């Protein structure tokens, strides 16, 4: 019995007759490119992505952020072409390219990347690490303005915090410093949230440092709602994520229900929900800066747990599920002698009545 | 007469587990003499062209693209002789893991 194809067949467009006149590719690399490009199309049969979690295919993501900086496409392209012509006009660059002896100003590359295309890369990195899925659950923003976070490990020791870096609580014990370009006419809010580490409620996150009403770039001048608290991940379940969220606001936001006391050493009080906070301050706040990093357990976490939080250090462990074994039969057929060891409760000879 | 040895028992070469069956690690999903079903995610390939699951979950079958190994000269020649719009498809058997990797349980609150 035959059935009708539910759509277009893959190799039905090319003709079977006169294969010699039809052009072919002779490169395994070209064939690999073609196959990888065709594997990403929404086919009608059962594919690999549908069974292994393509994330529901397309997702209508809500965009909550600043509009892109409106630039003149014609003038930008003209200036870029002029710069390219000026660069290729040099003969020394051609000599260096021929001799394979040429270097690149990586600092200028990093700066220009942060200026023109850093936001989108940081957005996709945050999507990969699962930032928006846990901060808003339905919306991803674009970090238009940059944000440089730095911790001080000494006098000349400065550790930066990039998107997804691994910074230990030993360096993260003291309050970090933030840097970002902004005029002296706006207001900003910084929020450090720990997405993993809450013992009781898995759907909630902790707050370590919340400071609102930042005049321009002066972060110290702004009023701090919650004092800075060093990270404290569990010893068993490691590699928690800590996210620095920067929101731009238009009006002077005042809030008393979200105000934290000076000690603020209560985990019940340090129970936060970014979704609810953004629902409350959606009229004024707009996310524009994002800086998340990884953090695992170290020797400095015991001090934070004992002296600051007044708690006993909890220890977890990555325990694995027990291996599966079939139902034990009365007469195992062709099974090794160790078959009785798979159902042994303990390796101790049990003497019932003797 | 003239024909001898024409008798030989069957090898039971066929597909063992169908789509939707919950299998465990190590179960032979399908056996074959020639390459009729290729393995995919979490499906190994024995030296006798047998397909066995490596993780515990649900068995699936999908029509996917075929990119041969660059060391196989025959397949490389076939690919290079294929026309511009040809892409080879095969039937890959997959095992979608249902059980999670592990759990974080409290050991001792030190």
């Amino acid at each position: 019995r035959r059935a009708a194809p539910l759509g277009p067949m893959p190799n039905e467009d090319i003709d079977v007759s006169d294969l010699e006149r039809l052009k072919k590719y002779r490169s395994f690399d070209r064939y690999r490119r073609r196959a990888e490009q065709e594997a990403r199309k929404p086919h009608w049969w059962r594919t690999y992505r549908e069974h292994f979690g393509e994330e529901s295919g397309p997702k209508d993501r809500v965009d909550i952020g600043l509009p892109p900086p409106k630039v003149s496409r014609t003038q930008q392209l003209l200036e870029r072409k002029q710069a390219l012509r000026e660069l290729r006009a040099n003969v020394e660059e051609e000599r260096a390219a021929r001799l394979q002896t040429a270097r690149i100003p990586l600092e200028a590359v990093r700066a220009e990347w942060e200026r023109t295309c850093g936001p989108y890369h940081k957005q996709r990195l945050a999507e990969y690490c699962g930032l928006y899925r846990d901060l808003f659950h339905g919306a991803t923003f674009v970090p238009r303005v940059p944000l440089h976070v730095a911790y001080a490990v000494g006098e000349d020791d400065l550790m930066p915090v990039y998107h997804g870096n691994e910074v230990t609580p030993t360096e993260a014990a003291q309050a970090p410093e933030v840097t970002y370009e902004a005029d002296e006419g706006s207001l900003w809010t910084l929020l450090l949230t720990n997405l993993d580490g809450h013992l009781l409620e898995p759907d909630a996150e902790y707050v370590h440092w919340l400071v609102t009403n930042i005049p321009g770039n002066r972060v110290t001048e702004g009023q701090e709602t919650c004092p800075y608290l060093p990270p404290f991940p569990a010893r068993g379940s490691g590699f928690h994520r800590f996210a620095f969220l920067l929101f731009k606001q238009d009006k002077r936001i005042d809030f008393s229900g979200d105000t934290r006391p000076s000690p603020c050493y209560q985990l019940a009080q340090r129970t936060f929900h970014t979704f609810d906070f953004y629902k409350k301050h959606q009229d004024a706040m707009t996310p524009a800066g994002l800086a998340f990093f990884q953090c695992r357990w170290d020797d400095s976490v015991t001090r934070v747990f004992h002296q600051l939080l007044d708690m006993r250090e909890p220890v977890f462990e990555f325990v694995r599920p027990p291996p599966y074994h079939p139902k034990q039969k009365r007469f195992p057929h062709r099974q090794p002698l160790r078959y009785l060891d798979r159902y042994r409760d303990s390796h101790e000879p049990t003497y019932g009545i003797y | 007469s003239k024909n001898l040895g024409g008798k030989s028992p069957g090898k039971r070469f066929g597909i063992k587990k169908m789509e939707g069956h919950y299998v465990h690690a190590g179960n032979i999903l399908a056996t074959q003499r020639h390459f009729r079903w290729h393995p995919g995610a979490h499906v190994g390939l024995g030296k006798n062209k047998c397909l066995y699951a490596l993780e515990e979950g649900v068995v699936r079958y999908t029509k996917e693209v075929y990119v041969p190994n660059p060391s196989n000269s025959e397949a490389v020649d076939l690919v290079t002789r294929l026309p511009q719009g040809a892409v080879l498809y095969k039937t890959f058997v997959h095992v979608v893991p249902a059980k999670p990797e592990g759990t974080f349980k409290l050991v001792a609150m030190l």
């Binding site: 194809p5 539910l6 090319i14 294969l19 049969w45 | 029509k63 076939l78 498809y89």
Partner: peptide, 21 residues
């Protein structure tokens, strides 16, 4: 399978032939 709508998807021998007046 033969009774499935996706029958003959692995068909490739009609794409290459490897076997003047």
């Amino acid at each position: 399978y033969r009774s499935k709508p996706t029958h003959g998807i692995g068909r490739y021998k009609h794409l290459v032939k490897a076997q003047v007046r």
